[PDB]
Design a protein around this ligand. Structure first.
Ligand code: FAD
Length: 450
């Protein structure tokens, strides 16, 4: 119940109507600070709380793989909120007009949203504040430590962000109090039915018109996310430290699609892992990625308006890449050639098949995949657009602060340091095909994804 997690977007005349939780990033009912804080305000004013989700016109920028995963979880979400006497309303259109109309139509008293540092979220908020007079609060329900409290500036390395985040852990790492039930807009299936129809022409296929995506790797919903966490801790947490860099072994947690859509709280994952009596070396490696690297991605996007642009790169990286702009590239590939996996690197290729077929590329190959796009592009800016385009289109965890921070790490050296000076790539960290062969059995990875 710590009120540091709450930030006031606008202070207006407090209405006497239902507290509206505008759910965007954290699509879950358990372990949701935004959902709990909305219920707290509802109790204090003796008024019910409601949940509103907006289905924006931007779903056509992505594929069916992301659309189905989000909506199937929401269908489970609606029934979960119903058993807590909480009605969920699902609107279709721009949030700027849809939230404003819903606020006036339903006589909203307090408006609550979850925190997301992405530009598109800031786009909606600007419109919403321009059409309401009721108070507007936001809650960081995605980070263990609130983004504005962990640091008040951009952090240039994990070395600097780790002590600030770990010092605030004894305060913000706590259990979740129960969501007490409330005291006392057509359908979901049809929206998903018409959404798939509008996206079907853009489906990814491989020659024979057979769909490339395989939807049986990660089931959606809050329930499935919990089982994945239980599976990871019981079976793969011990070997996470020593096998996380091997793409031939499914040793990863596989929590990112649930983490991105907010189907499971990262704080819940950290709480359970801390209780687990596993390999302390593997535990330290795991908490680094879900706490340091995950929450520094929000820090990167929150304190850099141009997080997806060349301007956000460190100065040493910008000048190093600028000094190698005119170096002749060994090869140049178009976006269509990158998309289809038609490069001269069978290792880079096979990473694309895993991305296209499963929607989740291995973490280690994600670094190789992004850095080779820089090596084989006309300019670093062109590689930035290609990497963002492919990641957001085909990753189930894409369109996330982790994605923009991860690409910025691979291409622009964000949260990194200078390495040996090479041509084309400059001082950016370089990952070689020969180097990967010495780290894992590349042939097994290639044969898996042909
Ligand atoms: C170029 C690039 C693109 C990426 N695209 C995305 C993205 O769009 N969305 C996304 O959520 N992840 C992205 N990843 C980050 C990371 O690769 C994934 O989080 C991870 O691979 C997801 O699979 P996992 O949960 O089984 O990994 P795990 O080893 O199980 O890690 C668990 C969690 O820690 C976090 N995490 C792990 N590695 C990183 C990292 N390098 N940076 C930040 N957080 C991390 C993730 O939340 C992850 O879910 C990207 C990284 C890079 C370098």
């Amino acid at each position: 119940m710590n009120p540091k997690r709450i930030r006031a977007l606008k202070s207006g005349k407090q209405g006497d109507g239902p507290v509206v939780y505008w759910m965007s990033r954290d699509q879950r009912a358990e372990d949701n600070w935004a959902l709990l804080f909305s219920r707290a305000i509802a109790k204090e004013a003796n008024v019910p709380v409601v949940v509103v989700f907006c289905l924006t016109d931007e779903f056509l920028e992505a594929g069916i793989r992301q659309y189905e995963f989000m909506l199937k979880g929401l269908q489970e979400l609606e029934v979960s909120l119903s058993r807590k006497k909480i009605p969920s309303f699902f609107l279709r259109g721009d949030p700027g007009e849809k939230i404003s109309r819903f606020v006036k139509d339903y006589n909203a008293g307090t408006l609550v949203t979850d925190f997301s540092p992405l530009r598109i979220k800031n786009q909606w908020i600007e419109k919403v504040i321009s059409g309401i007079s009721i108070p507007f609060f936001e809650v960081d329900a995605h980070n263990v430590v609130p983004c504005w409290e962990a640091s008040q500036k951009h952090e240039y390395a994990a070395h600097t962000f780790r002590p600030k985040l770990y010092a605030l852990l004894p305060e913000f790492l706590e259990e979740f109090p129960e969501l007490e039930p409330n005291s006392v807009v057509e359908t979901l299936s049809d929206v998903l039915e018409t959404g798939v129809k509008a996206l079907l022409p853009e489906r990814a296929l491989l020659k024979n018109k057979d769909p490339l995506f395989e939807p049986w790797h990660f089931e959606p919903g809050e329930k499935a996310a919990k089982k994945v966490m239980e599976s990871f801790i019981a079976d793969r947490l011990d070997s996470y430290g020593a096998l996380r860099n091997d793409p031939t072994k499914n040793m990863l947690s596989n929590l990112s699609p649930y983490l991105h859509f907010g189907q499971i709280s990262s704080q819940r994952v950290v709480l359970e892992v801390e209780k687990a009596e596993s390999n302390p070396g593997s535990k330290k490696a795991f908490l680094d990625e879900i706490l340091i690297w995950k929450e520094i991605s929000d820090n990167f996007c929150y304190y850099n308006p141009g997080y997806d642009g060349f301007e956000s790169f460190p100065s040493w990286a910008k000048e190093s890449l600028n000094a190698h702009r005119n170096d002749v590239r060994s090869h140049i590939y178009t976006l269509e050639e990158f998309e289809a996996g038609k490069t001269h690197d069978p290792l880079w290729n096979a990473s694309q098949m895993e991305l296209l077929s499963t929607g989740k590329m291995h973490g280690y190959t994600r670094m190789y995949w992004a850095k080779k796009i820089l090596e084989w592009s006309e300019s670093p800016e062109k590689a930035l657009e290609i990497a963002i385009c492919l990641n957001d289109r085909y990753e189930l965890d894409g369109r996330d602060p982790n994605g923009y921070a991860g690409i910025a790490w691979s291409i622009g050296g964000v949260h990194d340091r200078a390495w040996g000076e090479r041509e084309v790539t400059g001082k950016i960290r370089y990952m070689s095909y020969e180097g990967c062969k010495r780290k894992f059995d590349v042939k097994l990875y290639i044969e898996k994804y042909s």
